[PDB]
Amino acid sequence: TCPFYKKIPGTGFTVDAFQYGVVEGCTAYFLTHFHSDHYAGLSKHFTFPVYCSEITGNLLKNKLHVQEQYIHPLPLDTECIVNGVKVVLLDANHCPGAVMILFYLPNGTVILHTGDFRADPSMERSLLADQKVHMLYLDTTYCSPEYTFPSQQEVIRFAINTAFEAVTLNPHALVVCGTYSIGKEKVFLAIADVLGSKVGMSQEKYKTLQCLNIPEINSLITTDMCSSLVHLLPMMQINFKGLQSHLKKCGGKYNQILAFRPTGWTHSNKFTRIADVIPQTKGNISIYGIPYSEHSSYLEMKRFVQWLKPQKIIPTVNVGTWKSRSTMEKYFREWKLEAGY
Ligand SMILES: OCc1cn(-c2ccc(Cl)cc2)nn1
Numbered sequence: 001t002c003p004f005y006k007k008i009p010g011t012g013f014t015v016d017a018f019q020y021g022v023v024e025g026c027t028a029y030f031l032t033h034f035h036s037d038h039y040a041g042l043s044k045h046f047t048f049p050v051y052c053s054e055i056t057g058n059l060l061k062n063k064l065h066v067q068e069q070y071i072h073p074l075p076l077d078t079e080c081i082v083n084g085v086k087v088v089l090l091d092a093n094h095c096p097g098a099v100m101i102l103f104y105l106p107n108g109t110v111i112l113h114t115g116d117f118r119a120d121p122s123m124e125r126s127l128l129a130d131q132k133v134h135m136l137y138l139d140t141t142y143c144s145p146e147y148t149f150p151s152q153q154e155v156i157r158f159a160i161n162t163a164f165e166a167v168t169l170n171p172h173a174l175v176v177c178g179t180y181s182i183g184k185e186k187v188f189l190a191i192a193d194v195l196g197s198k199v200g201m202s203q204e205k206y207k208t209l210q211c212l213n214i215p216e217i218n219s220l221i222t223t224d225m226c227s228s229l230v231h232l233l234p235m236m237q238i239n240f241k242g243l244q245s246h247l248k249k250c251g252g253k254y255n256q257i258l259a260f261r262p263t264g265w266t267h268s269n270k271f272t273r274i275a276d277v278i279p280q281t282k283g284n285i286s287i288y289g290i291p292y293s294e295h296s297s298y299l300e301m302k303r304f305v306q307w308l309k310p311q312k313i314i315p316t317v318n319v320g321t322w323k324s325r326s327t328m329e330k331y332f333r334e335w336k337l338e339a340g341y
Pocket residue numbers: 305306307308309310311312313314332333335336337339341
């Protein structure tokens with residue numbers, strides 16, 4: 001059964017609700033972004049209207065083979081009417097094509113659904129600035145003060161500098177980056193750019209990246225592994241056994257691997273700075289875990305909510321335990337009182 005927090009009251013709409021069969025009274029299904037926990041259920045046999053971004057629509061058509069007649073892409077930052085209701089899609093600063101959705105109910109209620117997002121002060125000057133929001137359906141992934149991490153810019157500087165140093169010292173070193181979904185493309189693109197290389201990858205991953213409208217992508221990626229010194233592999237293979245195996249397949253072109261795993265949060269953030277990060281090393285293989293997040297830190301989330309001043313908050317992540325729910329509600333009350341309501 002579909003949970004209450006995926007239903008938009010006073011409308012026929014659901015959000016990220018494709019794994020529940022036919023939802024009673026749902027006339028339009030919104031999809032915030034192409035991550036599997038959110039799209040789970042869609043296929044070529046889906047025959048209800050799906051509303052999403054242009055990039056998300058490209059991925060639905062080409063990767064899941066959803067029929068074109070049921071895909072309804074909408075432009076960003078533009079007032080659109082869907083089944084008699086005004087909606088706007090806003091950039092979520094998550095993965096490519098990820099959106100937040102503003103719904104303007106007929107009775108005057110305004111609802112923001114963040115999907116998955118990384119809150120940023122730039123959002124304080126979108127179409128959100130223009131009106132009051134009554135209800136906020138909030139990505140609470142990291143809603144606890146222990147969740148601190150650096151800016152994406154600081155993390156990319158560390159990765160570029162580390163990779164450039166390693167390959168300048170040893171021109172026969174290979175760089176490997178892990179991936180298991182769209183998002184965090186800057187990690188591998190920025191490293192390839194500083195080394196003067198394209199990023200080599202499987203045919204399936206190249207297909208996925210061709211759906212994303214990234215400027216000059218044909219200039220940065222390839223399926224020719226032999227011509228590339230930055231390789232993408234499945235996240236599951238970023239370990240000493242899997243990387244040893246990959247190195248054998250390169251046929252003596254390389255004698256060292258430097259690998260990156262771009263994880264969300266890892267407790268070592270609590271103790272140390274980005275400048276202080278060190279790898280795990282065995283023989284001629286080193287693995288760096290880097291805290292590249294596409295979700296709000298606690299402080300980023302707090303600032304966004306204190307700026308927006310919603311009347312009601314509905315969490316969409318960590319909702320399955322009473323301890324988690326109680327903890328989040330205590331922070332929401334703190335934020336409200338500190339904002340002086
Ligand atoms: O779900 C009820 C609710 C609303 N709020 C809230 C928090 C911060 C600000 Cl600034 C305004 C409202 N907290 N809990």
